[PDB]
């Protein structure tokens, strides 16, 4: 509260670290469904169903241009990619499986880096 601060968690490496994690996700072999925005002119349903599209390239631009106020807002966008994937794809499709794998991959790097 006012003039009563919790000790300062060092956040000064967060930007570099989230960039590294993102690089690792960008280069995973199962990243392919997630690298670019879903083409909303060519994928029926996507526009109306998925209220908040997200993809790795958009996260990379946001990160590069100071659009994440902190590491949690970054983790929210990453998870949103996989949540959208689960909403639109059957678990037993190549894309649905890619999404599960990528989430698992992300969450391990996140825990190992920050927790």
UniProtKB/Swiss-Prot annotation:
As for subcellular location, the record says:
Nucleus
Report the domain of life of the source organism.
Eukaryota
Per UniProt, residues of the Bromo domain are 9-113
Tissues where this protein is expressed: Expressed at varying levels in several tissues, whereas a smaller transcript was expressed specifically in testis.
Cystines in this chain: none
Subunit details for this protein?
Component of the BRF-1 ISWI chromatin remodeling complex, at least composed of SMARCA1 and BAZ2B, which regulates the spacing of histone octamers on the DNA template to facilitate access to DNA. Within the BRF-1 ISWI chromatin remodeling complex interacts with SMARCA1; the interaction is direct. Component of the BRF-5 ISWI chromatin remodeling complex, at least composed of SMARCA5/SNF2H and BAZ2B, which regulates the spacing of histone octamers on the DNA template to facilitate access to DNA.
- Describe the task this protein carries out: Regulatory subunit of the ATP-dependent BRF-1 and BRF-5 ISWI chromatin remodeling complexes, which form ordered nucleosome arrays on chromatin and facilitate access to DNA during DNA-templated processes such as DNA replication, transcription, and repair. Both complexes regulate the spacing of nucleosomes along the chromatin and have the ability to slide mononucleosomes to the center of a DNA template. The BRF-1 ISWI chromatin remodeling complex has a lower ATP hydrolysis rate than the BRF-5 ISWI chromatin remodeling complex.
User: What family is reported?
Assistant: Belongs to the WAL family.
Listed name of the protein: Bromodomain adjacent to zinc finger domain protein 2B
What organism, scientifically named, is this protein from? Homo sapiens
